[PDB]
Amino acid sequence: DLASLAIYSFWIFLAGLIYYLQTENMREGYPLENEDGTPAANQGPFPLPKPKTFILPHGRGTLTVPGPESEDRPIALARTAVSEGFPHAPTGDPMKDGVGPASWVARRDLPELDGHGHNKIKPMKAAAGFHVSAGKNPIGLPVRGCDLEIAGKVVDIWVDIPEQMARFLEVELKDGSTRLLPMQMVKVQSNRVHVNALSSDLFAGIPTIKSPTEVTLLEEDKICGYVAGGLMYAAPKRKS
Amino acid sequence: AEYQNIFSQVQVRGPADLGMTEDVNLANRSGVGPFSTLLGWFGNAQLGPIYLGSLGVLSLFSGLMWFFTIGIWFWYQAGWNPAVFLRDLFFFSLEPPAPEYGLSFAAPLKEGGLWLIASFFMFVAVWSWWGRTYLRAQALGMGKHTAWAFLSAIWLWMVLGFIRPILMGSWSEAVPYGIFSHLDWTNNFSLVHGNLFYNPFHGLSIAFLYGSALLFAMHGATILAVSRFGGERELEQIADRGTAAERAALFWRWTMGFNATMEGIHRWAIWMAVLVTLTGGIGILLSGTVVDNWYVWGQNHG
Amino acid sequence: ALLSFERKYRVPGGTLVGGNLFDFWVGPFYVGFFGVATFFFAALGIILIAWSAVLQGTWNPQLISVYPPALEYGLGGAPLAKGGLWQIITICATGAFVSWALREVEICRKLGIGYHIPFAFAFAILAYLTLVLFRPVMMGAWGYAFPYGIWTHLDWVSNTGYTYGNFHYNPAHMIAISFFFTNALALALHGALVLSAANPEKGKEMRTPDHEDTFFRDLVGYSIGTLGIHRLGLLLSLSAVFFSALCMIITGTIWFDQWVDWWQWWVKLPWWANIPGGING
Numbered sequence: 001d002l003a004s005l006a007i008y009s010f011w012i013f014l015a016g017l018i019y020y021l022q023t024e025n026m027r028e029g030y031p032l033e034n035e036d037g038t039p040a041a042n043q044g045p046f047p048l049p050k051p052k053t054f055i056l057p058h059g060r061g062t063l064t065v066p067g068p069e070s071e072d073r074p075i076a077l078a079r080t081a082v083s084e085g086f087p088h089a090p091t092g093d094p095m096k097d098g099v100g101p102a103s104w105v106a107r108r109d110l111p112e113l114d115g116h117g118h119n120k121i122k123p124m125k126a127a128a129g130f131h132v133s134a135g136k137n138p139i140g141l142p143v144r145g146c147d148l149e150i151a152g153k154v155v156d157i158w159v160d161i162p163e164q165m166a167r168f169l170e171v172e173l174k175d176g177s178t179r180l181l182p183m184q185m186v187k188v189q190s191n192r193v194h195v196n197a198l199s200s201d202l203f204a205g206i207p208t209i210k211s212p213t214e215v216t217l218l219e220e221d222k223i224c225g226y227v228a229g230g231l232m233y234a235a236p237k238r239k240s
Numbered sequence: 241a242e243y244q245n246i247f248s249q250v251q252v253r254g255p256a257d258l259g260m261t262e263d264v265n266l267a268n269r270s271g272v273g274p275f276s277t278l279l280g281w282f283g284n285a286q287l288g289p290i291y292l293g294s295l296g297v298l299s300l301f302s303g304l305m306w307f308f309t310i311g312i313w314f315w316y317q318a319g320w321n322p323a324v325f326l327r328d329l330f331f332f333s334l335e336p337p338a339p340e341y342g343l344s345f346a347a348p349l350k351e352g353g354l355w356l357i358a359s360f361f362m363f364v365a366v367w368s369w370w371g372r373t374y375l376r377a378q379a380l381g382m383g384k385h386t387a388w389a390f391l392s393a394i395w396l397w398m399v400l401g402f403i404r405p406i407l408m409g410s411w412s413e414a415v416p417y418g419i420f421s422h423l424d425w426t427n428n429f430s431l432v433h434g435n436l437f438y439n440p441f442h443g444l445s446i447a448f449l450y451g452s453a454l455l456f457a458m459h460g461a462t463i464l465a466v467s468r469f470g471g472e473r474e475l476e477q478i479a480d481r482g483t484a485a486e487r488a489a490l491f492w493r494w495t496m497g498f499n500a501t502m503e504g505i506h507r508w509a510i511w512m513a514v515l516v517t518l519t520g521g522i523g524i525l526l527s528g529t530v531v532d533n534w535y536v537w538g539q540n541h542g
Numbered sequence: 543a544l545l546s547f548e549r550k551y552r553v554p555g556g557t558l559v560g561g562n563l564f565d566f567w568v569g570p571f572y573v574g575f576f577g578v579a580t581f582f583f584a585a586l587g588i589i590l591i592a593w594s595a596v597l598q599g600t601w602n603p604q605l606i607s608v609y610p611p612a613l614e615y616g617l618g619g620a621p622l623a624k625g626g627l628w629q630i631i632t633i634c635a636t637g638a639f640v641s642w643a644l645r646e647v648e649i650c651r652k653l654g655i656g657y658h659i660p661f662a663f664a665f666a667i668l669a670y671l672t673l674v675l676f677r678p679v680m681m682g683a684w685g686y687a688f689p690y691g692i693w694t695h696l697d698w699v700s701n702t703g704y705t706y707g708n709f710h711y712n713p714a715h716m717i718a719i720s721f722f723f724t725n726a727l728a729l730a731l732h733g734a735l736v737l738s739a740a741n742p743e744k745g746k747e748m749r750t751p752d753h754e755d756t757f758f759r760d761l762v763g764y765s766i767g768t769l770g771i772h773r774l775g776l777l778l779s780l781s782a783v784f785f786s787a788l789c790m791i792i793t794g795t796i797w798f799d800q801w802v803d804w805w806q807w808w809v810k811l812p813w814w815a816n817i818p819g820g821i822n823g
C-alpha cells in the first residue's frame with residue numbers, strides 16, 4: 001500500500017542525498033595522499049564532485065573547487081617512524097616554523113572587505129564613529145603573559161566594522177613595536193589583560209603586519225596560528 | 241580560566257548600519273532602532289531597521305487578525321472576566337466545525353465558524369510571509385534557500401489543518417487553537433491511529449529532530465572552538481580556506497573518520513533540519529487517510 | 543590516508559594519559575590511550591549484548607532487547623539472565639561514552655582548539671546517565687531504567703509516559719520541547735542563510751556577511767549575526783537536552799501523580815479559585 005511505497009521510496013531518496021551530500025563535502029583537501037604527498041591508492045567509494053566556480057565579489061577573481069591543492073609553504077617535519085600513521089616531529093621551532101597547533105595556511109595577502117569594498121577590519125583609531133560600548137575598555141591595560149610577566153600595553157582595538165565586534169587587540173611591546181592579539185585568546189580583566197597561550201618572551205615572536213592599518217588573510221592566519229600554538233609550545237614557561 | 245567566547249567581553253559600537261542596498265526598495269525599509277547592550281553580549285545590538293511593505297503589511301495585519309479572532313473567543317468564554325481569563329488561559333479553546341458540517345463553510349459562528357475565520361486569516365498570514373521570505377532574497381540577489389527551507393515547515397502545517405481535513409472529509413479533523421487543547425488533540429491523534437510510535441515517518445522525523453540538536457551542537461561548538469582563527473567568518477573561509485576550516489575538518493576526521501567542508505557542513509545542516517517536517521508531514525498525511533492503525537500496518541506492512 | 547593539508551597537523555603531543563605510547567593514527571582515526579579504552583569497552587559490551595541475544599534465543603535485531611533487573615532486585619545486582627547483563631552493559635556504555643569524550647579532549651589539544659565539542663557532548667552523556675543511573679537510583683531500583691532494544695525502548699518511553707497521564711503536561715517537558723523545535727528552526731535558517739549567500743543568483747557574485755545580516759533585518763528586523771548564531775545553536779541544543787534531563791529527574795521522584803493535575807496550583811490561586819465562570823467554574 002501507499003505507506004509501504006512511500007517509505008521504500010524515501011529510504012532511496014535518503015541514500016542518494018547522503019551521496020550527494022558526501023561528494024559535495026569532498027571539494028577541499030581531496031584527493032587523499034600519502035605522507036609523502038603521493039596520491040593515496042584508495043579514495044573510498046565516492047568520486048570527486050564535478051567542479052564549481054565561485055565568483056568573488058570585488059574583482060578579487062574566481063574560485064573553482066575541487067582544484068589543485070598545495071601547501072604553498074615549506075613544512076618542517078621529519079617522520080618519526082617507518083610506517084604510515086605516526087607523528088611527524090618538527091625539525092625546528094614549530095612556532096617559528098608554523099607547524100603543529102601553530103600551523104597557518106597560506107591564505108591570500110589581501111584583506112577581507114566588507115560588503116562595500118572597504119576593509120572588513122580596522123584599528124578603532126581609524127574606525128570613524130566607533131567606541132567601546134559595554135565591558136571593560138582594554139585600551140590602556142598592560143598585557144600579562146602565562147609566565148605572569150608583563151609584555152606590553154594595549155594601544156588600540158581593531159574592530160570589525162560590519163559586525164561591529166572587537167577582533168584583535170593591538171599591543172605595544174618594550175620594543176615600541178606592536179603586535180595584534182586575537183580577541184578570542186585573551187582575558188580582559190579589571191586592571192590587566194591576561195594572555196595565557198604566550199609567555200612574555202614570545203610576544204616579539206608574534207608575526208607582524210605589513211600595513212599598520214590593515215591585516216591580510218595571510219597575516220591573520222600566521223598570527224592566530226602563532227598564538228594558538230603557544231598553548232602547546234609555551235606550556236613549559238606557562239606558569240600556573 | 242581560558243576564554244570561551246560564549247559571551248563577548250568588550251562590546252564595541254559605531255554608526256547604525258543601514259545595510260546593503262542591492263535592489264531593496266529603500267523606500268520601504270524603516271529607520272534604525274535602538275541598540276540592546278543586553279543583546280550585545282550574545283550577538284548584534286542593532287535592532288532594526290526592517291523592510292515592511294505590502295506583503296509584510298498584509299501578512300502582519302492578518303497575523304493579528306488571526307491572533308485576535310482567537311483571543312476574543314477566549315474572552316467570550318472567560319465571561320469577560322479578567323480573573324477567569326487569567327485563571328483559565330490554557331484551558332480555553334477555539335475548536336473546528338463539528339463533523340456534522342464536515343468541510344462545510346456554513347457552520348454557525350459559535351459552533352466552528354469562528355475557527356474557519358481564524359484559519360483563513362492564518363492561511364493568508366503564512367503564505368504572504370512565505371512570499372516575503374522569497375522576495376527579500378531576490379532583492380539582494382541571494383539564493384532562495386530560506387524559502388525552500390520554509391516550505392518544509394509550511395508542509396506539515398498545511399497537512400495538519402488543511403490537506404488532511406479535506407482528505408478526511410471534515411474540518412473537525414483539524415487542530416483547535418488552544419494551548420492545552422492542541423496538546424490533547426495530539427495525544428489523542430496518536431491513540432486513534434494505533435500509536436504513532438509505529439508510524440515509520442514519525443520515527444524518521446524524530447531521528448532528524450534529535451539529529452538537528454546533535455548537529456547544531458556539533459557545528460556550533462566547532463565554530464566556537466576555532467573562532468580563535470576567525471571560524472565564524474564562514475563566507476571568506478569558503479572562498480579561501482583558512483586554518484580554521486582545516487582544524488575544524490581535521491578534529492572531526494580524527495574523531496569519526498570523515499568530515500565536512502565549510503560550505504558542506506551547511507548543506508548537512510539545511511537538509512538535516514528540513515527533513516524533520518518533510519518526513520513529519522508525510523507520516524501524518526497517510527495517517528487515517530490510508531493507514532487506520534500503525535500497529536496493524538506494522539504487522540503486515542500492506 | 544591524509545587530506546591534502548593534514549600532515550603539518552600530525553605532530554606529536556597533546557595526550558592526557560600515557561605520553562607517546564598511543565600517540566598515533568589508524569587510517570583517519572586518532573587512537574588515544576582513550577582510543578584504546580573506548581575500543582575495549584565497546585568490544586566487551588557488544589559481546590555481552592550478543593550473549594543476551596542467546597539467552598533470549600533471537601538474533602533478529604528488531605527483537606533483541608536487554609532489560610534491567612526487575613524492581614525486586616532494587617539497586618542490588620541481578621543474575622545475568624535476570625538483569626546482571628544489562629547492568630554490566632550499562633557500565634560498559636558509560637565507559638565507552640566518557641572515554642570517547644576524553645579522546646575528543648586529546649584531539650582538541652593536538653590541534654590547538656577550544657574544548658566546546660567535548661563539552662557539549664557531555665550533555666548527551668548526562669542525559670543518558672539521568673535515565674539509566676540518577677533516576678533509577680533516586681527511585682530505588684535499576685528497574686526504572688529503559689531497556690536496550692530498538693522497539694522495547696520506545697515501549698518504555700510510552701508506558702513511562704502514560705504512567706503520569708499525558709506527559710505533555712510535565713512543565714519542564716514543555717520547556718525542553720520548545721528548544722528542540724526552536725533549535726531545528728534555527729539550524730534550518732542558519733544553513734539556509736549561508737548557502738544562499740555562498741550560492742547567489744547566477745553569474746552573480748558570492749554575497750557577503752553584510753548581505754546576510756541585511757537579509758534578516760529586512761525580514762524580521764533583527765540579526766543576531768555570525769558569532770551569534772553559532773553561540774545560539776550551541777545553546778539551544780544544550781538547553782533542549784538540559785531540560786529533557788530535568789523533566790525526567792523530577793518525574794517519579796518529587797512528583798509521582800498525574801502531570802496535568804499539577805496545573806491545579808495555578809487555577810486554585812485564592813484570588814480566582816472560587817470565582818464562577820470560564821472553564822473552571
Ligand code: BCL
Pocket residue numbers: 397400415419420422423426710715716717719720721723724727
Ligand atoms: C508538533 C505536533 C503538534 C504540537 C505539539 C506540541 C507539544 C507536545 C508541545 C507544543 C508546544 C508548543 N506549541 Mg505545538 N504542536 C503542533 C503545532 C503547533 C503550531 C502550528 C502548527 O501552527 C503552533 C503555533 C504551535 C505552538 C506551540 C507553542 C505554544 C509551544 C512552543 C512553541 C515553540 O517552541 O516554537 C519554537 C519557536 C518560536 C519563536 C515560537 C514560540 C511561540 C511562543 C510565543 C509560545 C510561548 C507561549 C507563552 C507566551 C504562553 C503564556 C506564558 C505566560 C505564563 C502568560 N504548535 C502540532 C499540533 N506543541 C510545547 C508547549 O509547551 O506547549 C504548551 C509542547 O510541549
Ligand code: BCL
Pocket residue numbers: 442443444446447448450451454588670673688692693695696699
Ligand atoms: C532520549 C529519548 C528517549 C528515546 C526515544 C526515542 C524515540 C521516541 C525514538 C527513538 C529513536 C531512535 N533511538 Mg532512542 N531514545 C532514548 C535513548 C536512546 C539511546 C540512548 C542509549 O542514549 C540511543 C542510542 C537511542 C537510539 C535510537 C535509534 C535506534 C533511533 C534513531 C535515533 C536518532 O536518529 O538520533 C539522532 C542521532 C543520529 C542521526 C546519529 C546516528 C545515530 C545512529 C542511528 C545510532 C544507532 C544506534 C543503534 C542502532 C544501537 C547501536 C548500539 C550498539 C553499538 C550496536 N535512543 C531515550 C530513552 N528514540 C526513533 C526510532 O525511530 O527508533 C525506534 C524514535 O522514534
Ligand code: BCL
Pocket residue numbers: 362365366393394396397400425426427428429430435436437439441442445446449516517519520521523524699723726
Ligand atoms: C501522545 C503523543 C504521540 C505523538 C503524536 C504526534 C503528532 C500528532 C504529531 C507529532 C509530531 C512530531 N513528533 Mg510525536 N508523538 C509522540 C511522541 C513523540 C516523542 C517522544 C515520545 O519523546 C518525540 C521526540 C516526538 C517528536 C515529534 C516531532 C519529530 C514531530 C514534529 C516535528 C516538528 O518540529 O513540528 C513542529 C513544527 C511545525 C508544527 C510546523 C509549523 C510551521 C508554521 C508555519 C508556524 C507558523 C507560526 C504561526 C504563523 C504563528 C506565528 C508564531 C508566533 C509569532 C510565535 N513525538 C506520541 C507517540 N507527534 C508531528 C509529526 O510530524 O508526526 C509525524 C505531528 O503531527
Ligand code: BCL
Pocket residue numbers: 426427639666667668669670672673698699700701702703704708709710715718719722783785786787788789790
Ligand atoms: C507517550 C510518550 C510521551 C512522552 C514521554 C517521554 C519520556 C518518558 C521521555 C521523554 C523525553 C523527551 N521528550 Mg517526550 N513524550 C511525548 C511526546 C513528545 C513529543 C511530542 C511530539 O509532543 C516531543 C517533541 C517530545 C520530546 C522529548 C524530548 C524533550 C526528550 C527526548 C530527547 C532527549 O531527552 O535527549 C536526551 C538524549 C539522550 C539520552 C541521547 C544520549 C546518547 C548517548 C550519550 C550516546 C549514544 C551513543 C550510541 C550508543 C552510539 C552508537 C554507536 C554508533 C557508532 C552510532 N516528547 C508523549 C506525551 N518523553 C525523554 C527525556 O526527556 O529523557 C531525559 C524521556 O525519557
Ligand SMILES: CC[C@H]1c2cc3[nH]c4c(c3C)C(=O)[C@H](C(=O)OC)c4c3nc(cc4[nH]c(cc(n2)[C@@H]1C)c(C(C)=O)c4C)[C@@H](C)[C@@H]3CCC(=O)OC/C=C(\C)CCC[C@H](C)CCC[C@H](C)CCCC(C)C
Pocket residue numbers: 299300302303304307365366369370373386387389390392393513514515516517722723724725726727728730731734762
Ligand atoms: C523545518 C521546520 C522547522 C522550521 C523552520 C523554519 N521556520 C521558519 C523558517 C524556517 C526555515 C522561515 O524562514 C520563517 C521565518 O520567518 O524565520 C524567521 C519561519 C517561521 N516559523 C515560525 C514559527 C514556528 N516554526 C515552527 C517550527 C519549525 N520551523 C521547525 C522547527 C514552530 C513550531 C515549533 O511549531 C513555530 C512556532 C515563524 C517565526 C516564522 C513564520 C512567521 C509567520 O508566518 O507569521 C506571519 C505573521 C504573523 C502571524 C503576525 C502575528 C504574530 C502574533 C500572533 C501577533 C503578535 C506579534 C506581532 C508581530 C506584534 C506586532 C505589534 C505591532 C504594534 C507592530
Ligand SMILES: CC[C@H]1c2cc3[nH]c4c(c3C)C(=O)[C@H](C(=O)OC)c4c3nc(cc4[nH]c(cc(n2)[C@@H]1C)c(C(C)=O)c4C)[C@@H](C)[C@@H]3CCC(=O)OC/C=C(\C)CCC[C@H](C)CCC[C@H](C)CCCC(C)C
Pocket residue numbers: 450451452453454455457458495496580583584587588631634635638639642646659660661662663664665666689690691692695779780783
Ligand atoms: C547536546 C546533546 C545533543 C548531541 C550532541 C553530541 N553528540 C555527540 C557529540 C555531541 C556534542 C560528539 O562529539 C559525539 C560525536 O562524535 O558525534 C559525531 C556525539 C555522539 N552522539 C551519538 C549519538 C547520539 N547523540 C544523541 C543526542 C544528542 N547528542 C543531542 C541532540 C542521540 C539521541 C538523539 O538519542 C544519539 C543516538 C554518537 C553518534 C556520538 C558518540 C559515539 C560514541 O560515544 O562512541 C562510543 C561508543 C561506541 C562506538 C558504541 C557503543 C558501545 C556500547 C557499549 C554498546 C551499545 C550500548 C547501548 C546502551 C545500546 C542501546 C541501543 C538501543 C537504545 C536501541
Ligand SMILES: COC(C)(C)C/C=C/C(C)=C/C=C/C(C)=C/C=C/C(C)=C\C=C\C=C(C)\C=C\C=C(/C)CC/C=C(\C)CCC=C(C)C
Pocket residue numbers: 307308310311312314355356357359360362363397398399400401402415416417418419422
Ligand atoms: C491578551 O488579550 C488579547 C486581546 C491580546 C487577546 C489574546 C489572544 C490570545 C490569548 C490568543 C491565543 C492563541 C493561541 C494560544 C493560538 C494557538 C495555536 C496552536 C496551539 C496551534 C495551532 C495549530 C493549527 C494549525 C495546524 C492550523 C492550520 C491552518 C491551516 C493550514 C489553514 C486552514 C485553512 C482554511 C480554514 C481555509 C480558508 C480558505 C482558503 C484561502 C483556502
Ligand SMILES: CCCCCCCCCCCC[N+](C)(C)[O-]
Pocket residue numbers: 247278279281282764766
Ligand atoms: C530575535 C531572537 C533573538 C534570540 C537571542 C536571545 C539571547 C539572549 C541571551 C542573553 C543576552 C545577554 N546576557 C549576557 C546579559 O545575558
Ligand SMILES: CCCCCCCCCCCC[N+](C)(C)[O-]
Pocket residue numbers: 018440441443444447511512
Ligand atoms: C542526514 C542523514 C542522517 C539520517 C539518519 C538516518 C538514520 C535514522 C534511522 C531511523 C530508524 C527508523 N525507522 C524507519 C525504522 O523508524
Ligand SMILES: CCCCCCCCCCCC[N+](C)(C)[O-]
Pocket residue numbers: 044496497498568569570
Ligand atoms: C559511519 C562511520 C563511517 C566512517 C568512515 C571511515 C572511512 C575509513 C576509510 C578506510 C580506512 C581503513 N583501515 C581502517 C582499514 O585502515
Ligand SMILES: CCCCCCCCCCCC[N+](C)(C)[O-]
Pocket residue numbers: 617618619629630632633636675
Ligand atoms: C561512572 C560509572 C557508572 C556506571 C553505571 C552502571 C549501572 C549499574 C551498576 C550497578 C551494578 C551492581 N550493584 C548494584 C551491585 O552495584
Ligand SMILES: [Fe+3]
Pocket residue numbers: 459463474506732736772
Ligand atoms: Fe556555520
